[PDB]
């Protein structure tokens, strides 16, 4: 888990969010062993987003091939607890949207956030990704997560695309407000290993 100094920084920075926005959240990974986290305000931009290494390994390579291409040595370096940690210190009463409730609804619960609400779009199928290509022109650098090549060749999932897509999906447009992380790499992260001396 996190440090008494990065989960006071955590806090700080999440206190960044307006607990009334609209926001969104998505996961990657099944909801008792998610591997990719997001949550974003359109409105702002603001968005906090985070990894976490998985405990079962045979469901993630299938998750990895079929759905959002993570290479699982690219989790060894994330920061631990923070799954936790930021669902711990979500506002009270807060309301998420979200596209496709079942698996969000169980993770919230397994923390005791019962008193979180959902609100389900839910789009059909390919609505929802109306506007896959153009995010994944304008904001890929956002998150460079997703190294494998995905099959069903598809473009991989990835939380945080996930969510800028359907917020232009139900606004009919891909034109955001520029998404902006409150987090800090170096709480997402740990250091990893030393420059290459070149
Ligand atoms: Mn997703
Ligand atoms: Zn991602």
């Known amino acids: 888990g996190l440090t008494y100094s990065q ?6 920075s999440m206190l960044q969010l307006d ?14 062993d998610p591997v990719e986290i997001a949550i974003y305000q359109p409105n702002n931009g603001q ?8 405990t079962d390994i045979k469901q993630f390579k299938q998750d990895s091939k079929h759905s959002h291409g993570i290479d699982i040595q690219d989790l060894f370096s994330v920061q631990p607890g923070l799954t936790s940690a930021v669902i711990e ?21 397994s923390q005791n956030r019962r008193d979180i609400k959902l609100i389900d779009v839910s789009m059909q199928k390919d609505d929802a990704r109306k506007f896959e290509d153009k995010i994944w022109d304008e904001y890929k650098h956002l998150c ?18 996930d969510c800028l897509m ?4 139900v606004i009919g ?3 955001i407000p520029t998404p902006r992380p409150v987090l800090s790499r170096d709480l997402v992260f ?8 070149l």
């Open 190 to 197: 740990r250091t990893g290993p030393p420059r290459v001396v």
């Open 144 to 161: 460079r997560m997703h190294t494998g090549i995905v099959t069903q060749e598809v473009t991989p999932h990835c939380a945080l695309l």
């Open 173 to 175: 447009s891909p034109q």
């Open 47 to 54: 968005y906090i987003h985070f990894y976490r290494e998985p």
């Open 166 to 169: 359907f917020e232009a999906a």
């Open 89 to 109: 210190s979500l506002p009270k009463n807060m309301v998420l949207s979200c596209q496709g409730a079942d698996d969000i609804r169980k993770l919230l619960d």
């Open 19 to 32: 607990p009334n926005a609209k926001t969104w959240i998505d996961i990657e990974g099944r909801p008792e």
């Open 7 to 12: 989960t006071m920084e955590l806090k700080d």
